[PDB]
Design an enzyme around this catalytic site. Structure first.
Site, PDB file in Angstrom:
ATOM      1  N   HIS A   1      17.616 -85.500  -5.826  1.00 53.18           N
ATOM      2  CA  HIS A   1      18.963 -85.991  -5.595  1.00 53.18           C
ATOM      3  C   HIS A   1      19.292 -87.027  -6.659  1.00 53.18           C
ATOM      4  O   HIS A   1      18.485 -87.942  -6.908  1.00 53.18           O
ATOM      5  CB  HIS A   1      19.100 -86.602  -4.203  1.00 53.18           C
ATOM      6  CG  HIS A   1      20.505 -86.975  -3.853  1.00 53.18           C
ATOM      7  ND1 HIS A   1      21.448 -86.043  -3.483  1.00 53.18           N
ATOM      8  CD2 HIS A   1      21.127 -88.176  -3.826  1.00 53.18           C
ATOM      9  CE1 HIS A   1      22.593 -86.655  -3.240  1.00 53.18           C
ATOM     10  NE2 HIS A   1      22.424 -87.950  -3.439  1.00 53.18           N
TER      11      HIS A   1
ATOM     12  N   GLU B   1      15.019 -87.128 -13.566  1.00 59.63           N
ATOM     13  CA  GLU B   1      14.692 -86.066 -12.626  1.00 59.63           C
ATOM     14  C   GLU B   1      13.574 -85.184 -13.164  1.00 59.63           C
ATOM     15  O   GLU B   1      12.635 -84.841 -12.436  1.00 59.63           O
ATOM     16  CB  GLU B   1      15.937 -85.235 -12.336  1.00 59.63           C
ATOM     17  CG  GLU B   1      17.092 -86.027 -11.748  1.00 59.63           C
ATOM     18  CD  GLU B   1      18.346 -85.186 -11.614  1.00 59.63           C
ATOM     19  OE1 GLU B   1      18.227 -83.943 -11.617  1.00 59.63           O
ATOM     20  OE2 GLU B   1      19.452 -85.757 -11.517  1.00 59.63           O
TER      21      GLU B   1
ATOM     22  N   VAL C   1      20.371 -85.794   5.221  1.00 55.73           N
ATOM     23  CA  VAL C   1      19.842 -86.511   4.066  1.00 55.73           C
ATOM     24  C   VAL C   1      19.314 -87.887   4.434  1.00 55.73           C
ATOM     25  O   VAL C   1      18.616 -88.518   3.628  1.00 55.73           O
ATOM     26  CB  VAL C   1      20.916 -86.626   2.954  1.00 55.73           C
ATOM     27  CG1 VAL C   1      20.328 -87.267   1.696  1.00 55.73           C
ATOM     28  CG2 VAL C   1      21.511 -85.261   2.629  1.00 55.73           C
ATOM     29  N   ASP C   2      19.607 -88.346   5.651  1.00 54.86           N
ATOM     30  CA  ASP C   2      19.217 -89.672   6.106  1.00 54.86           C
ATOM     31  C   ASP C   2      17.759 -89.725   6.551  1.00 54.86           C
ATOM     32  O   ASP C   2      17.087 -90.742   6.346  1.00 54.86           O
ATOM     33  CB  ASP C   2      20.126 -90.114   7.252  1.00 54.86           C
ATOM     34  CG  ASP C   2      21.562 -90.257   6.824  1.00 54.86           C
ATOM     35  OD1 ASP C   2      22.421 -89.511   7.341  1.00 54.86           O
ATOM     36  OD2 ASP C   2      21.826 -91.107   5.949  1.00 54.86           O
TER      37      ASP C   2
ATOM     38  N   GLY D   1      19.676 -75.085 -13.940  1.00 55.11           N
ATOM     39  CA  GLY D   1      18.243 -74.996 -13.765  1.00 55.11           C
ATOM     40  C   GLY D   1      17.400 -75.834 -14.702  1.00 55.11           C
ATOM     41  O   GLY D   1      16.251 -75.470 -14.978  1.00 55.11           O
TER      42      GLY D   1
END
Ligand SMILES: Nc1nc2ccn(CCCCCc3ccc(C(=O)N[C@@H](CCC(=O)O)C(=O)O)s3)c2c(=O)[nH]1
Ligand SMILES: NCC(=O)N[C@@H]1O[C@H](COP(=O)([O-])[O-])[C@@H](O)[C@H]1O
Length: 200
Positions: A108, A173, A143-144, A11
């Site tokens: 991601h 991130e 995911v595309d 997390g």
């Protein structure tokens, strides 16, 4: 904008989102943290910040739709507007993704469309790129189709392992994910009718 964060582990992205949403100018508020796994550190961070938590064990359900329904019910309970996937390791069902289309973000650890799927860092190191990064995108059925909101490049250093590379990517991130949330929550970014990213 009311936000749920779905987690599966440590997390650190959750924590970065908590920190940023406690800023006065934040357009997002985190109202519920949902984990599919118990006793993960992300639940402690949520409780330490005063945020309700729900564990919804995916293993206790027959298929994804029954599991997703349990999640969708909590999202309705808490009148959620936006869903952030922050280390969430469960693929979601089509109807769930359809319902939350344009309302669900995911972080991601690659520069999509490179290295989709679960072991992006492994793939990046096997491929031998010297630049990787992370991507915040809207979630689509695969995911595309997910429209990209932000990305940040991160160098691959020689000798990098999953441990050292992911540590460096996570710093990026923790930057682009809160920013992407702030963009969507404030209405600055949305999916257009085109289904492509629209900047206002
Ligand atoms: N419909 C849809 N659903 C979702 C959920 C996250 N993302 C976007 C994030 C994409 C990141 C890549 C991956 C995330 C999870 C993976 C996976 O394989 N989960 C296994 C358990 C594996 C394990 O923990 O051993 C499973 O769920 O069976 S792969 C999406 C999306 O774009 N479309
Ligand atoms: N399947 C997508 C995926 O692997 N995402 C990755 O999981 C980690 C979660 O860490 P955290 O729990 O410390 O935020 C993050 O590094 C994120 O890029």
């Amino acid at each position: 904008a009311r936000v749920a964060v779905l987690i599966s582990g440590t997390g650190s992205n959750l924590q970065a989102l908590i920190d940023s949403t406690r800023e006065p100018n934040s357009s997002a508020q985190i109202d519920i943290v949902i984990s599919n796994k118990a006793a993960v550190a992300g639940l402690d961070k949520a409780e330490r910040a005063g945020i309700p938590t729900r564990v919804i064990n995916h293993k206790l359900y027959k298929n994804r739709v029954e599991f997703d329904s349990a999640i969708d019910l909590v999202l309705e309970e808490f009148s959620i507007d936006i869903v952030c996937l922050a280390g969430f390791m469960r693929i979601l069902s089509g109807p769930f993704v359809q319902k939350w289309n344009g309302k669900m973000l995911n972080i991601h650890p690659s520069l999509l469309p490179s290295f989709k799927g679960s072991n992006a860092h492994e793939q990046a190191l096997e491929t031998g790129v010297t630049v990787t990064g992370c991507t915040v995108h809207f979630v689509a059925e695969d995911v595309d189709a997910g429209q990209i909101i932000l990305q940040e490049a991160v160098p691959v250093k020689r000798g990098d392992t999953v441990a050292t590379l992911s540590e460096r990517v996570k710093l990026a991130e923790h930057k682009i994910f809160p920013a992407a949330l702030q963009l969507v929550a404030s209405g600055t970014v949305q999916l257009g009718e085109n289904g492509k990213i629209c900047w206002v």
